[PDB]
Amino acid sequence: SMLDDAKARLRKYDIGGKYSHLPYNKYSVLLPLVAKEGKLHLLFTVRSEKLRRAPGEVCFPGGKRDPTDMDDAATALREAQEEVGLRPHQVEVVCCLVPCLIDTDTLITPFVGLIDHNFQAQPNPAEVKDVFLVPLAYFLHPQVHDQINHIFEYTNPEDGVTYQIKGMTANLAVLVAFIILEKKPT
Numbered sequence: 001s002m003l004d005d006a007k008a009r010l011r012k013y014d015i016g017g018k019y020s021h022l023p024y025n026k027y028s029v030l031l032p033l034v035a036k037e038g039k040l041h042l043l044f045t046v047r048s049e050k051l052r053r054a055p056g057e058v059c060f061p062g063g064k065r066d067p068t069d070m071d072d073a074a075t076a077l078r079e080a081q082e083e084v085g086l087r088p089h090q091v092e093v094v095c096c097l098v099p100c101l102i103d104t105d106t107l108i109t110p111f112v113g114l115i116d117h118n119f120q121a122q123p124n125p126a127e128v129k130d131v132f133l134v135p136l137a138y139f140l141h142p143q144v145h146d147q148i149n150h151i152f153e154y155t156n157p158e159d160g161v162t163y164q165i166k167g168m169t170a171n172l173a174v175l176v177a178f179i180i181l182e183k184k185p186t
């Protein structure tokens, strides 16, 4: 099946807990996969304009590890619940992808999660201005604008709204698309 095939692909790239004890400032992100209309999608947030870090930017759900978290995956799930109302029974964490090093002292660990079909986002407006889906296949043939660095523009055909996706967030989206969609029969 589509979902069994995605999980099987993802497991081959799982690094597990290999980098998780290193003494960094630690953040986790959740890369949330949603199946709709017979295709996989990623769920993104737009960050509230009130936030100190990166107001108004497109981001995956996530945030800084705190003492309550049993592990890095727990960080991602806690923050996702705060931001968009995703409950733990509504997500299956499938793997941990390559972590992202930034600023010399920070390590961001990305986890891919399969999202239940009955989840409906409840954006928390103190943290998130918007929540939206992009089909995974978009990231194989994105609409690129050079700003010099590459920016993706995605227009939602439901409403005509255009979102800009860039940086670590864009890079991770492409990685997930390659992992799941490469070399597939039609």
Ligand SMILES: COc1ccc(CC(=O)Nc2cncc(OCC(=O)N3CCNC(=O)C3)c2)cc1
Pocket: 027, 028, 029, 045, 046, 047, 048, 051, 052, 053, 059, 060, 061, 062, 063, 064, 083, 106, 108, 127, 128
């Ligand atoms: C250091 O590089 C990273 C590491 C992790 C992340 C993921 C991330 O933050 N996702 C997120 C998505 N949408 C809305 C969000 O609002 C919550 C928020 O940003 N908070 C929580 C209240 N106070 C804060 O200081 C910050 C957060 C982004 C960048």
